[PDB]
Structure 1
Amino acid sequence: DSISLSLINEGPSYASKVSVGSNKQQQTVIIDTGSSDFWVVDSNAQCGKGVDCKSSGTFTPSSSSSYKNLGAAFTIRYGDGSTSQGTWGKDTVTINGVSITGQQIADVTQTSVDQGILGIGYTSNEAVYDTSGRQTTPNYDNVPVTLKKQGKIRTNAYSLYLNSPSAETGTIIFGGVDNAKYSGKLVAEQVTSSQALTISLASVNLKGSSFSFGDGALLDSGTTLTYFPSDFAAQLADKAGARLVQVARDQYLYFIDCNTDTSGTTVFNFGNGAKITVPNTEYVYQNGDGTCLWGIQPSDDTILGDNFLRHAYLLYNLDANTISIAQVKYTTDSSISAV
């Protein structure tokens, strides 16, 4: 028992069509290993200034017979600064024809995000706290836990295949692994946080140099680029020719020339001899205006986002606290086994 789900490459994010409610209201929502809550855009939501939040499906609780309004306010803030608020609820959730009943979700009535987010991380990272810092509702079974508890999948685990940079679609598989879509063997890496799907990154090879790291890296489907601590990012920037630019009182971004040569690769070395090679095409990101960001950015939180994850096949196993990785093989061939 595996559940395959198509990932829509939206550019900065990967999203899937799922349904919510007794009447199977279709939502296109970001698939996010870096958060743990599933929330949907209410049909009467007030979008954030300049945000078109109702273009990727909306949810009308009043037309679902199964919708339950829990007591309780919902609030979340993401790493990029965007936020969503609303109320906690429960309803039926349907993922490629597989339904789970009474799944706790949030009905969001105000947001600066463009669409809903299906957070599939650990339950201990659920946004169950208000802006006073107080826990306002208990930790709860999120979507992957409920899939397991209702007998849909054997293990709380899922495999991620974002597919190639130009691809319209990839695939996430709950409770399974597609053995046709990687070369070599999947190497298991120990998760190093009890809250976040981080693994130890030993080093990065770039432009013929090896840069020792030796700290955790979040493997986040819901981050567009790659983030490293300021001093390490600056060591890499020195080889790449990326230039730090102050964009706000406390925000700096690496820019790079749009016509910069993108030949070569960057190699990421993890535990147990596991190795992912990323083409340097992944390090030039086009902004609207004829400037480009470098694919690496500074942050106190280390994150390997989509521009890394496109080049790995990953089996996240939240029961075993492992993420198993191998170099991706782009192919329509498929041979899925249950995990």
Structure 2
Amino acid sequence: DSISLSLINEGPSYASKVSVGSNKQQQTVIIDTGSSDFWVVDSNAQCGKGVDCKSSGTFTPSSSSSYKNLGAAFTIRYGDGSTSQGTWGKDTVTINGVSITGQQIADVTQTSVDQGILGIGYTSNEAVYDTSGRQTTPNYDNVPVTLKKQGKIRTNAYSLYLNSPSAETGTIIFGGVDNAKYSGKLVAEQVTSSQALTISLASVNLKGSSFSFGDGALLDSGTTLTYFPSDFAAQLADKAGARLVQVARDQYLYFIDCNTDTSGTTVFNFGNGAKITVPNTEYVYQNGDGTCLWGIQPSDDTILGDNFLRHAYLLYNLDANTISIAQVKYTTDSSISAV
């Protein structure tokens, strides 16, 4: 048994329809390997300033005969600084027709995120702490764990196919892998973190130069661009011809000529030999103003986001603590087998 779920290419992130409650209230929520909690926008939520947080569906707990209030406060803050707060609850969650009962979720009543988020990472990365660092509620079975426990999938694992930059939709498959959608063989890479879905990136090849790395990179579906440590990003930037711009008090972004030559590729080599080749088109991010961001940015965190992941077929295995990777093959052909 596998469960395929369509991913809507929404621009900065990828979202899916998921229903919640006895009355199956449909939500459109970001599919996020970079977080571990599923939360929905309450119908009576107050959105953050200038945020249209209710336009992708909302959840009315009082409409669901099966909703259970856990009474514990929920709070989460994401890498980009956006936040959500509400209360923990449990309800039935249905994903492409497959229902799991008593699934712990957060009913969010204030958020600066545009829509709900289905976090599908490790349970150890659940946002169960107050903003004092104190744990306020126990770690729990998140959606992938519950799919496994309730016999919907065999292994806590899922395959990610974001599809092409111009594609309308991709696919995530819980408990399965589509063998038609990559070239060569999947190569298993060791997850190197207790909390994050990170693997060892050995080197990056850009403009025919090799740049040795060797540290972990988070493979995050819920991050738009690619982020490297400042020093490493600067080496790549110099080669790429990107220029650093302070855009705010404590934020620096690389920009690049909108007309830069994007005919080449950037190659990512991983510890166990996985190899992903990314077209350089992925490193010119159109802003609205006739300026372009470079697709690589400096950060204390190393994150390979959507502009990388579109070019890989990835099988995340949270039981084995491996992520198996091969060069994507864009095709509607399908040959899915259970994992």
In 1, the alpha carbon distance for the partners of 2:193 and 2:282 equals: 27
Per-residue CA distance 1:280-299 (angstroms, 9 max, x = gap): 00000111222111000000
3-state SS of paired residue (2:180): coil
Cα displacement (A) at 1:239: 1.0
In 1, the alpha carbon distance for the partners of 2:110 and 2:291 equals: 31
Per-residue CA distance 1:109-128 (angstroms, 9 max, x = gap): 00000000000000000000
Per-residue CA distance 1:54-102 (angstroms, 9 max, x = gap): 0000000010000111121000000000000000000000000000000
In 1, the alpha carbon distance for the partners of 2:256 and 2:272 equals: 34
Under a length normalisation based on structure 1, what TM-score does the superposition of the two structures give? Answer: 0.99
In 1, the alpha carbon distance for the partners of 2:301 and 2:232 equals: 12
In 2, the alpha carbon distance for the partners of 1:15 and 1:286 equals: 21
Q: How many residues end up aligned between the 2 structures?
A: 339
In 1, the alpha carbon distance for the partners of 2:247 and 2:101 equals: 45
Find the counterpart in structure 2 of residue 231 from structure 1.
Answer: 231
3-state SS of paired residue (1:204): strand
In 2, the alpha carbon distance for the partners of 1:250 and 1:47 equals: 25
3-state SS of paired residue (1:59): coil
Cα displacement (A) at 1:132: 1.1
Per-residue CA distance 1:293-314 (angstroms, 9 max, x = gap): 1000000110000000000000
In 2, the alpha carbon distance for the partners of 1:21 and 1:279 equals: 42
In 2, the alpha carbon distance for the partners of 1:64 and 1:80 equals: 33
In 1, the alpha carbon distance for the partners of 2:229 and 2:181 equals: 32
3-state SS of paired residue (2:214): strand
In 1, the alpha carbon distance for the partners of 2:335 and 2:53 equals: 37
Per-residue CA distance 1:117-142 (angstroms, 9 max, x = gap): 00000000000001111100000000
Per-residue CA distance 1:129-165 (angstroms, 9 max, x = gap): 0111110000000000000000000000000000000
Under a length normalisation based on structure 2, what TM-score does the superposition of the two structures give? Answer: 0.99
In 1, the alpha carbon distance for the partners of 2:132 and 2:155 equals: 35
In 1, the alpha carbon distance for the partners of 2:51 and 2:288 equals: 16
In 1, the alpha carbon distance for the partners of 2:292 and 2:48 equals: 26
Cα displacement (A) at 1:260: 1.5
For structure 2, list consecutive stretches of 5 or more residues without a partner in the other structure.
none
Per-residue CA distance 1:13-67 (angstroms, 9 max, x = gap): 0000010000000000000000000000000111011111000000000100001
Cα displacement (A) at 1:194: 0.8
Cα displacement (A) at 1:10: 0.2
3-state SS of paired residue (1:223): coil
3-state SS of paired residue (1:81): coil
Cα displacement (A) at 1:166: 0.3
Q: Is 2:245 the counterpart of 1:245?
A: yes
Per-residue CA distance 1:170-224 (angstroms, 9 max, x = gap): 0000000000000000000000001000000000000010000000000000000
Question: Which range moved further: 61-70 or 255-264?
Answer: 255-264
In 2, the alpha carbon distance for the partners of 1:288 and 1:136 equals: 42
Per-residue CA distance 1:269-290 (angstroms, 9 max, x = gap): 0022210000000000111222
3-state SS of paired residue (1:91): strand
In 2, the alpha carbon distance for the partners of 1:149 and 1:5 equals: 19
Cα displacement (A) at 1:320: 0.2
What RMSD, in angstroms, separates the aligned Cα atoms of the two structures? 0.5
3-state SS of paired residue (1:236): helix
Cα displacement (A) at 1:247: 1.4
Find the counterpart in structure 2 of residue 271 from structure 1.
Answer: 271
Question: Which range moved further: 256-265 or 302-311?
Answer: 256-265
In 2, the alpha carbon distance for the partners of 1:234 and 1:158 equals: 34
In 1, the alpha carbon distance for the partners of 2:142 and 2:205 equals: 37
In 2, the alpha carbon distance for the partners of 1:273 and 1:115 equals: 37
